Design a protein around this nucleic acid. Sequence first.
DNA 1: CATAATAACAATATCTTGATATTGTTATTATG
Length: 319
Amino acid sequence: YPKTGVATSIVEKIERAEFNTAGRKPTVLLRIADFIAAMNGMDAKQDMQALWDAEIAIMNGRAQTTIISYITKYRNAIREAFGDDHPMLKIATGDAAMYDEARRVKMEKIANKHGALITFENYRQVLKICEDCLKSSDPLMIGIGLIGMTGRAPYEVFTQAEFSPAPYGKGVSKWSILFNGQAKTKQGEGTKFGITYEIPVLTRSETVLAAYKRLRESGQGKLWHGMSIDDFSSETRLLLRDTVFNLFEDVWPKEELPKPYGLRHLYAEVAYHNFAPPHVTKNSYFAAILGHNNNDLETSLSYMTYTLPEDRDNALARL
DNA sequence: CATAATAACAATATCTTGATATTGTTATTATG
């Protein structure tokens, strides 16, 4: 329980914003900075509650998801400045109704998605383009292609992936590689944090490994390698968004616009269509090749958004 | 006038059962 501390990263993002050529003012980070500053020397729990009530009063008219994210930022700032043993962490949090409502909305959306699958008609063309991206010299393209072939998150692919050959007896497997650098684990006890596990690929392993070798040994590749989430989000996110938008404009399902993370979803689908053993469940296989938490089958529910045209045909044939 | 750069604004999917870490989209800035 310290009374002193400073959220270093936030203030750094503030001072790196004063001499910007253009762009929004870091008003939220200012809010947080003044918050942490006002927290210095505070031992009056009531006044802490008043401060947080002020901060909450500020977020009004903003989306619930947005408010939740902001609260996450605040809590991480408090943890950075004062530590995990600070009473404010039990004050600076959203009311339970907000989280319960968010969960309800999430479950509702997932249910609706399972009730109305999107037929990925031109998925072979998408996998083909994504295969062609592996032979490009542009690190961005190679990254997109690696997302497509390995089903790793953009953050994983560009920043912290560790692809290595997977043994197949004495030789080397053709349709599987080893992966290390799982994200969003939060260093869970039963997660793939720092765990090298085997994943299937949608092309021959040699091509993937070679393309990734050309990725890491590039300039932009070593700029990306080891980045934080915010660095990458500010560096590549919009460019990646536009590039992905253009790459799969007229082959992507008409219902939705082509987003990068979709390449993961799709991946799983076809990864289940061409590699899945008969003694496992689709949920189990998804949770296996995606590197989900131990004994978790509920996260896999979020990836079942598409359906392959062949399966659609084999289900239409029911007459 | 005007289009590029930036962080607000927002939603998703993961570990966990109340939140965090990601991915995704838009309003606002300086500036020239």
